[PDB]
Amino acid sequence: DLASLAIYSFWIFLAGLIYYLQTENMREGYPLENEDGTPAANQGPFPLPKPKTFILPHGRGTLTVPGPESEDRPIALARTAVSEGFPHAPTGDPMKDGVGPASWVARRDLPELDGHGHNKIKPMKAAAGFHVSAGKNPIGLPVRGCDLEIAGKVVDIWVDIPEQMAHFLEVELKDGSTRLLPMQMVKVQSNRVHVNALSSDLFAGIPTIKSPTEVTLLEEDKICGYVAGGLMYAAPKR
Amino acid sequence: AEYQNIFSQVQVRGPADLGMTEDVNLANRSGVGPFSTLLGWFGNAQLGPIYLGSLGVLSLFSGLMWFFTIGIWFWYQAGWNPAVFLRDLFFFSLEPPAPEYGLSFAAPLKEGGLWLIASFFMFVAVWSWWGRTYLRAQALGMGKHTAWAFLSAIWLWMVLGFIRPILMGSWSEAVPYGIFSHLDWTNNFSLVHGNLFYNPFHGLSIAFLYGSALLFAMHGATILAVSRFGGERELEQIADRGTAAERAALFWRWTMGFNATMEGIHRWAIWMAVLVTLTGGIGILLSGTVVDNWYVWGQNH
Amino acid sequence: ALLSFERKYRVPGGTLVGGNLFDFWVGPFYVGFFGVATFFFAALGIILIAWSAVLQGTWNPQLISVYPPALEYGLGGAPLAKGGLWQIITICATGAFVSWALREVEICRKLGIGYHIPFAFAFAILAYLTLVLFRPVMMGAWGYAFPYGIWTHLDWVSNTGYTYGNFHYNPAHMIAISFFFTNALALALHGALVLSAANPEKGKEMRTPDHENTFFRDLVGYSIGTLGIHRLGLLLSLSAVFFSALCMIITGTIWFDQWVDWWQWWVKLPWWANIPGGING
Numbered sequence A: 001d002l003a004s005l006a007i008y009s010f011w012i013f014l015a016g017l018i019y020y021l022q023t024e025n026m027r028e029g030y031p032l033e034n035e036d037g038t039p040a041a042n043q044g045p046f047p048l049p050k051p052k053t054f055i056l057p058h059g060r061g062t063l064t065v066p067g068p069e070s071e072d073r074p075i076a077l078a079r080t081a082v083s084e085g086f087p088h089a090p091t092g093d094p095m096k097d098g099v100g101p102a103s104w105v106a107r108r109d110l111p112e113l114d115g116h117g118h119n120k121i122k123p124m125k126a127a128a129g130f131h132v133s134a135g136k137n138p139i140g141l142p143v144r145g146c147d148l149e150i151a152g153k154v155v156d157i158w159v160d161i162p163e164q165m166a167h168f169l170e171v172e173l174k175d176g177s178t179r180l181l182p183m184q185m186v187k188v189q190s191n192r193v194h195v196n197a198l199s200s201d202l203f204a205g206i207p208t209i210k211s212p213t214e215v216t217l218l219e220e221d222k223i224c225g226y227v228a229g230g231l232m233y234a235a236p237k238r
Numbered sequence B: 001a002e003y004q005n006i007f008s009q010v011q012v013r014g015p016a017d018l019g020m021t022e023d024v025n026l027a028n029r030s031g032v033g034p035f036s037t038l039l040g041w042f043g044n045a046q047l048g049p050i051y052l053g054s055l056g057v058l059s060l061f062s063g064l065m066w067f068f069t070i071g072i073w074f075w076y077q078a079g080w081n082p083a084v085f086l087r088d089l090f091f092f093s094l095e096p097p098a099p100e101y102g103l104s105f106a107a108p109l110k111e112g113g114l115w116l117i118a119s120f121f122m123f124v125a126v127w128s129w130w131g132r133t134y135l136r137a138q139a140l141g142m143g144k145h146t147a148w149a150f151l152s153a154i155w156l157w158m159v160l161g162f163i164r165p166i167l168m169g170s171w172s173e174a175v176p177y178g179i180f181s182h183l184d185w186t187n188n189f190s191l192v193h194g195n196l197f198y199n200p201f202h203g204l205s206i207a208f209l210y211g212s213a214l215l216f217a218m219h220g221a222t223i224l225a226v227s228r229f230g231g232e233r234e235l236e237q238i239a240d241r242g243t244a245a246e247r248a249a250l251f252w253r254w255t256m257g258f259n260a261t262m263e264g265i266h267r268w269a270i271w272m273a274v275l276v277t278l279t280g281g282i283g284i285l286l287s288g289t290v291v292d293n294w295y296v297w298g299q300n301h
Numbered sequence C: 001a002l003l004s005f006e007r008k009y010r011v012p013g014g015t016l017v018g019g020n021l022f023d024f025w026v027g028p029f030y031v032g033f034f035g036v037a038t039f040f041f042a043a044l045g046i047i048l049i050a051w052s053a054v055l056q057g058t059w060n061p062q063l064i065s066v067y068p069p070a071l072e073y074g075l076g077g078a079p080l081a082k083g084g085l086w087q088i089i090t091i092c093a094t095g096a097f098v099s100w101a102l103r104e105v106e107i108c109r110k111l112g113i114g115y116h117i118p119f120a121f122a123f124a125i126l127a128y129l130t131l132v133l134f135r136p137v138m139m140g141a142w143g144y145a146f147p148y149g150i151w152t153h154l155d156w157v158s159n160t161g162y163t164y165g166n167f168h169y170n171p172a173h174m175i176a177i178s179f180f181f182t183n184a185l186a187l188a189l190h191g192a193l194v195l196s197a198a199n200p201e202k203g204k205e206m207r208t209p210d211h212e213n214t215f216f217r218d219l220v221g222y223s224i225g226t227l228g229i230h231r232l233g234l235l236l237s238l239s240a241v242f243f244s245a246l247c248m249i250i251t252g253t254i255w256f257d258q259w260v261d262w263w264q265w266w267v268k269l270p271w272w273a274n275i276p277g278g279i280n281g
């Protein structure tokens, strides 16, 4: 029967498709490892896919995956049990060590470039023509921490030009320097911006960017990680 | 308390983004449209510009011709009475030629001719628009993924109003042009073929329909969940994995034992959606041509 | 085993119940209080189902079916073999879904991400409870719920719908179907966009969000933006289920006649009800 042939065939196809799909999704994080960093014995029934190479724009090079996997950074954690499967405790300050919900990845220390080779994220002051178009403008509002103490003030908004979306709030600390805060980790209110993830005393700990008019992928990761990490590690102040 | 990122807290605007030029003929690119602060709370506030080469004009013309062919007939059914037009709006319908005419074009205008005409305009409108999804991609140097996925939708459509009616031997098999009637045609089609729930392809198609909603809910939510680590910048997370992509993968690994990659998830996505109309098109194509009753067919195979 | 970048995230904390009691993993699976709860609820329910399979007389997946109490039992309890097991299994199912959500909330807390996923999952759960709990209870009996069987539940879908004629006429069912169709459309597009950029024509360089916005801008005159499309997929999906739940919560309760006749309120509108011509005149 023709219908019987079609349905039988489709399942063969669907199985091969799932296989393909599962392998495609193994281009990162694999091979699997034991908590000590060595190859795990059991990798599963799915093999690693033949490598593929992405040609990055603006001469940033290429990315070939699968490829040698490495954190390229120290992990300040230690086993808390004699067997696999348990939590690894922060050896130092998780916030400062960047582990747990405060983890950051060692991304490239360059900024993201739009399709035109320009920086994707820039403070609004340096983005020609960009301005707040709707909703309460946070610039000028004082920034309050989960401890209900003011930790600074909003001195600018960092924008994603290609998307024309607000990404960070540049906040000035009492020492005069500034920090970036993920738009999604802040609550813009009528008379202030509220930050639940961090307590006043923790804003200074937020990683800082090298150049004042640009942030790099590596820097964004340390900033976002640190702030999110506050939800768990700030707790004692909130 | 905590922000969810469903609506923007504050919108920003800058010069109208005119987009990448690449190999695109800017002569056919229109000018920017207005900005919608309304749209801005949810997504991008900029309307336009839109590209419109020849194919674009062709497609838009056929499209409107199609719609107007159906609409004029709708008016005629209301006796050109505005009041009757609005109240019976969902009851009007442009039916295909009766069986008697087979696949010919003899059928009178008020008896299938207009349907064939409207159908003709739609055929041109859809296929021209398809070529358009391919070319707009080519002009930007991008892959042809969109045009391929759109083909899967075209498949069901093609099967419903052209391929099946043909194999079946008559245009009477095709779907009528009407809100309620097209629903009736759907119910009747199932009754007439032994109930599609028995059609293995209708069942797979449903799995993917529900699947697309499950997966997009998962994915969409996931990205929003890690948008605080810039997870929405999917292409760059594909080119340089960040903590967003890792937490996304680990939420699912820890939850269900396995996970995706920032690029792969989109492969799961494109197939989940695309298989809805793929399996569906087969299911329908086989109905009446190879299987008259799925319940029956089911009893044997 | 662990993903190459996983250890830094497997730290203590995030649990809602039991402190570090169940704070550990089993292979790739995170456990947690709710991981244990879920297993319990799930194991029981599966066992109770295998038992219903014995009382029904079959081990075949295509045949095993577990029906709720017959209408005559109302909202009370019924003998195990006569709707009791169903009632118990439903308890387990609910217990396992809600536990799964909560487990998710814990995973979120440990990973420092938003609660969007479990929040989304909650809509599915609510759809389920509308069919086996809220609608039944509003209608007066568990018999109105669907049976747990691969094919038998499709029967219930069919009979339930035809009890009102063509279910297509349910106005809320129409909206729900739209979102489902639109969602599938959106998913196909979103996936094809990202992929057409990450995988350009042979030898070319990866395109960019700018290219993505450009592509849709050229194609239809608008691009929702990367944050927007994800906001959209979520919205479409959830809206689709919300309206599904709504299309049924109103069926058999505030409306129990033929859904097609519901549309008469519009046609019978005074200012054109009696005008001749058209389909309804």
Ligand code: BCL
Binding pocket: B197, B202, B203, B204, B206, B207, B208, B210, B211, B214, C046, C128, C131, C146, C150, C151, C153, C154, C157
């Ligand atoms: C709201 C819709 C109606 C309904 C209408 C239909 C129709 C119409 C169809 C199905 C179909 C299916 N339905 Mg149903 N279905 C309902 C409620 C449910 C519930 C539930 C707890 O509420 C469950 C678990 C299912 C499950 C299923 C799958 C067996 C099947 C296709 C998977 C799919 O589409 O996945 C979307 C989700 C995914 C792809 C994720 C993976 C989900 C896996 C596949 C589900 C496993 C279910 C399992 C076999 C039984 C329980 C597990 C055991 C306890 C261990 N339905 C309600 C009553 N259903 C299709 C079919 O082929 O039926 C024979 C079909 O045509």
Ligand code: BCL
Binding pocket: B122, B125, B126, B153, B154, B156, B157, B160, B185, B186, B187, B188, B189, B190, B195, B196, B197, B201, B202, B205, B206, B207, B209, B276, B277, B279, B280, B281, B283, B284, C157, C181, C184
């Ligand atoms: C009583 C009716 C029968 C029944 C009869 C049918 C029939 C008949 C069919 C389906 C089909 C489908 N059914 Mg069913 N179905 C029933 C019950 C169900 C139930 C349920 C819970 O009960 C569910 C979940 C489904 C689900 C589904 C979907 C999986 C599938 C449609 C895929 C789709 O997205 O097409 C959406 C998309 C298209 C049709 C794509 C084509 C789009 C075209 C190319 C573009 C439009 C161009 C246009 C010019 C632009 C317009 C205007 C501009 C916007 C301005 N059915 C009952 C039992 N069903 C279809 C299928 O494939 O089945 C196998 C089908 O033919």
Ligand code: BCL
Binding pocket: B186, B187, B210, C097, C124, C125, C126, C127, C128, C130, C131, C156, C157, C158, C160, C161, C162, C166, C167, C168, C173, C176, C177, C180, C240, C241, C243, C244, C245, C246, C247, C248
């Ligand atoms: C002849 C039949 C009638 C009809 C009768 C009905 C009836 C009756 C119903 C629908 C419902 C629906 N109909 Mg209808 N419907 C018809 C024709 C159609 C057509 C079409 C093309 O013709 C379409 C597209 C639809 C579409 C729809 C959807 C909007 C909706 C189902 C999805 C949903 O709510 O999921 C909601 C999602 C769930 C219920 C799943 C919950 C998942 C749970 C929480 C988790 C499962 C975990 C699992 C057990 C674990 C498995 C193991 C693991 C995999 C390891 N119908 C015809 C006219 N339709 C349903 C609705 O609105 O339901 C609320 C419904 O009840």
Ligand SMILES: CC[C@H]1c2cc3[nH]c4c(c3C)C(=O)[C@H](C(=O)OC)c4c3nc(cc4[nH]c(cc(n2)[C@@H]1C)c(C(C)=O)c4C)[C@@H](C)[C@@H]3CCC(=O)OC/C=C(\C)CCC[C@@H](C)CCC[C@@H](C)CCCC(C)C
Binding pocket: B059, B060, B061, B062, B063, B064, B067, B068, B125, B126, B127, B129, B130, B133, B146, B147, B149, B150, B151, B152, B153, B273, B274, B275, B276, B277, C181, C182, C184, C185, C188, C189, C192, C219, C220
């Ligand atoms: C894998 C299957 C899924 C899918 C995929 C899919 N659809 C697609 C694509 C893809 C990948 C495209 O690339 C293509 C697209 O361009 O998307 C934006 C498309 C598309 N899917 C569409 C529709 C569609 N897809 C559907 C479904 C699905 N699409 C599946 C779920 C459905 C249904 C029934 O569920 C519909 C209705 C089209 C919007 C678009 C293809 C457009 C096209 O062919 O246009 C040709 C003709 C016209 C210009 C039409 C004109 C009609 C006018 C008379 C309208 C209004 C006139 C009037 C109002 C003017 C005044 C305006 C006032 C409002 C002010």
Ligand SMILES: CC[C@H]1c2cc3[nH]c4c(c3C)C(=O)[C@H](C(=O)OC)c4c3nc(cc4[nH]c(cc(n2)[C@@H]1C)c(C(C)=O)c4C)[C@@H](C)[C@@H]3CCC(=O)OC/C=C(\C)CCC[C@@H](C)CCC[C@@H](C)CCCC(C)C
Binding pocket: B210, B211, B213, B214, B217, B218, B221, B255, B256, C038, C041, C042, C043, C045, C046, C089, C092, C093, C096, C097, C100, C104, C117, C118, C120, C121, C122, C123, C124, C125, C147, C148, C149, C150, C153, C237, C238, C241
């Ligand atoms: C709300 C909108 C959409 C959505 C979202 C959604 N679903 C989700 C999530 C989200 C956000 C998750 O996070 C969660 C997930 O883990 O993803 C893989 C999940 C999930 N959606 C699932 C299924 C599912 N979702 C569906 C639908 C949808 N999910 C919507 C379209 C459907 C259908 C029919 O459309 C199904 C079948 C699960 C794979 C997974 C949740 C897994 C889970 O809860 O595991 C705990 C329990 C067990 C392992 C076993 C329970 C066994 C017994 C106790 C009971 C079974 C009895 C009976 C009720 C079943 C009988 C079935 C018959 C009808 C055949």
Ligand SMILES: COC(C)(C)C/C=C/C(C)=C/C=C/C(C)=C/C=C/C(C)=C\C=C\C=C(C)\C=C\C=C(/C)CC/C=C(\C)CCC=C(C)C
Binding pocket: B067, B068, B070, B071, B072, B074, B075, B116, B119, B120, B122, B123, B157, B158, B159, B160, B161, B162, B163, B171, B175, B176, B177, B178, B179, B182
């Ligand atoms: C009041 O304002 C004025 C402008 C009149 C506007 C009013 C217009 C209105 C109210 C329009 C309403 C239109 C509606 C309701 C359209 C509805 C369509 C629906 C509900 C469903 C569509 C299903 C159609 C399908 C599956 C069509 C498939 C078509 C094909 C596969 C192509 C077939 C082509 C054929 C037969 C041509 C043959 C010719 C050759 C040789 C190639």
Ligand SMILES: CCCCCCCCCCCC[N+](C)(C)[O-]
Binding pocket: B200, B203, B204, B207, B208, B211, B268, B271, B272
């Ligand atoms: C991306 C593809 C993954 C989706 C796999 C969906 C599996 C659901 C299969 C259920 C329907 C079975 N059938 C033949 C009885 O209808």
Ligand SMILES: CCCCCCCCCCCC[N+](C)(C)[O-]
Binding pocket: A044, B256, B257, B258, C027, C028
């Ligand atoms: C019909 C679709 C249902 C599929 C159920 C399969 C769930 C797979 C869980 C796999 C993860 C396994 N593990 C432990 C090796 O990681």
Ligand SMILES: [Fe+2]
Binding pocket: B219, B223, B234, B266, C190, C194, C230
């Ligand atoms: Fe995405």
